[PDB]
Paper text:
Nonstructural protein 5 (NS5) is essential for the replication of the flaviviral RNA genome. The N-terminal portion of NS5 contains a methyltransferase (MT), followed by a short linker that connects to the RNA-dependent RNA polymerase (RdRp). The MT adds the 5′ RNA cap structure to facilitate translation of the polyprotein and to decrease elicitation of the host innate immune response. The RdRp initiates RNA synthesis by a de novo mechanism wherein a single-nucleotide triphosphate serves as a primer for nucleotide polymerization.
To examine whether the interaction of the MT with the RdRp will affect RNA synthesis, we compared the RNA synthesis activity of NS5 to that of a truncated protein, Δ264, which lacks the MT. To better understand the difference in RNA synthesis by NS5 and the RdRp, we determined the crystal structure of Δ264 at 3.0 Å resolution. The asymmetric unit contains eight RdRps that exist in two conformations (referred to as conformation 1 and 2) that vary in the locations of motif G, Loop 21 (residues 312–323) and Loop 51 (residues 742–750) that connect the thumb and fingers subdomains. The two conformations are affected by residue Arg483 that lies in the template channel. In conformation 1, the side chain of Arg483 inserts between motifs B and F and interacts with the carbonyl backbone of Gly604 and Trp476. In conformation 2, the locations of motifs B and F prevents the insertion of the side chain of Arg483. Instead, Arg483 interacts with Ala409 of motif G. NS5 that had the two aspartates in motif C replaced with alanines was unable to direct RNA synthesis either by de novo initiation or by elongation from a primed template. Δ264 synthesized approximately half of the de novo-initiated RNA product as did full-length NS5. However, with the template that directs elongative RNA synthesis, Δ264 synthesized sevenfold less product than did NS5. The RdRp alone was also competent for RNA synthesis, but was less active for RNA synthesis in vitro.
Residue numbers in the entry: 268 to 891
The structure:
Amino acid sequence: SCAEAPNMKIIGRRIERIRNEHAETWFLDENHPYRTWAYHGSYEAPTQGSASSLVNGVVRLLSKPWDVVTGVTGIAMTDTTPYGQQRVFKEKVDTRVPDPQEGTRQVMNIVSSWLWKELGKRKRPRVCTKEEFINKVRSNAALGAIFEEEKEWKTAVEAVNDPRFWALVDREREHHLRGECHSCVYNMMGKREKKQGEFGKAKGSRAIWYMWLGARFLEFEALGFLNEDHWMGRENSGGGVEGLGLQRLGYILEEMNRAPGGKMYADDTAGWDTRISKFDLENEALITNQMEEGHRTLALAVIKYTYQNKVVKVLRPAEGGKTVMDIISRQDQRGSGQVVTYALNTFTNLVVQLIRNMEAEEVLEMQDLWLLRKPEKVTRWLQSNGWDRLKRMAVSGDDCVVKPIDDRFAHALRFLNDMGKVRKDTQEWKPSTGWSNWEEVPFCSHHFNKLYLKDGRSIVVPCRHQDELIGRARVSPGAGWSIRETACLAKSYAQMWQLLYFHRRDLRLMANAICSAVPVDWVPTGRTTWSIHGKGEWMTTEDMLMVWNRVWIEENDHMEDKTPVTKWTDIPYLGKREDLWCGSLIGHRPRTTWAENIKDTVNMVRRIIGDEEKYMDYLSTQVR
Ligand SMILES: [Zn+2]
Ligand SMILES: [Zn+2]
């Protein structure tokens, strides 16, 4: 019910450009629903999104028992219509978290500037080049063109090979260096998901926003070194884990459990991106004091004009079926699709958890909440304990797992709530619940189990509820996708299961069915997960038994005995209790029928794709 006071001198340039590039249809809506955001104007626009997602036909026909399981059919029920997005905005994005008291702002100031120093000892900030951007971007990124001069392209790889795209970039950078910002504007779309189960992970209603491709280069140019040089990697950050895949996250949770201390706390912040305060964006900007003078100017141009002052375009339903685009402003919060969204969240989250250990270890008191009593004590505790507490953390974005020195961590909440990083689904002052067994700790939408191998070895495999994995695969990201295109996406989900969730009985059988129903020569396409830890080693025509040995045996630094595994039958499953607990259907009437007649179902899918294609029998590589 307060703010914004829009800094019109910084954002007003882009406002009048969007206004005057639509000056015939620009108007001011008196009935706009934006309470905590700064409204600027509206103009007519076509509709976008869909009330429901299309279902992958190949995966659906090969997963009949789950047509009645609400846990998997609900994942395809995402809503992206302008009405569905506005329902998310008024609930999760149109908020205002009160300012932390002055004493709390001091701790964040001290700890943040301390971590940037530790993070930049073995590393050196630098500018990122044009060729680094051309090699990193995939053929189909988000073009995100919003202006007239920016809609000259159709694909992302097409733009980067055109000297015209790098001409618009040079002008905006020259606009930045002169003190203005002319074209860095966010596109915002929303997803309202019909959800969920009790403790189902990963997917909730959220807002997705990103800038256009040229703006994200200037973003990647000034601060892209955080991702390219692996500043949030575990080797350099201690508590980070950037770069490690789902085949390695389990070992860290096990590594932490052996160290002495209390329980393992994996509390989850509700709406982490929205809970970012204007003081945290200042503390994240402390990295600017380590850059060369040419770099420092480019960085502040991105920070002041893209991070600390944002302009967003949002759709909204109007009268008579027509829709309309809104222009709004916001000074705090984090855009979900900023180039360094993951790195800046991992940093801030490390600072938050570092502070929470202080409140538990009786370093900070309620005195310090409203005014720092003795600020000389904060820097002392960080140098004799700060790095020891980072190495007992695992932070990936807004996901964190902390191993405190004792169980006073569960009650250290006053500094946490004042910083706005409130916990999800808990009373404001109820102590946090901890985990005694690391194999139950949630982290990155997964728990991690220890799989004992046939020859006396062991890997730590990732695991999650089975309905979330089948439901995701049954989703086709767009209409008009061909039969071949949907089959290649089905092959990607199947071969991903063969690499990470092979220990699940239903997933290995369904994967062998999909691989037996999709032609053997066809190259898998698509994106099976948007998580940073899904490195995508399954996107290949290579024999999945070969790639299994590479990520679990050959290149596993936790596996000293590197003797290869020859058969798929030599790799066990989880215990039937653990498999059933995570959503398996072993023993049920319809699942047993589906397993018996899976060859008949695979043969029918083969006829949809074509009798002419060459197929392989991956079901005969499994007898049990
Ligand atoms: Zn700009
Ligand atoms: Zn499990």
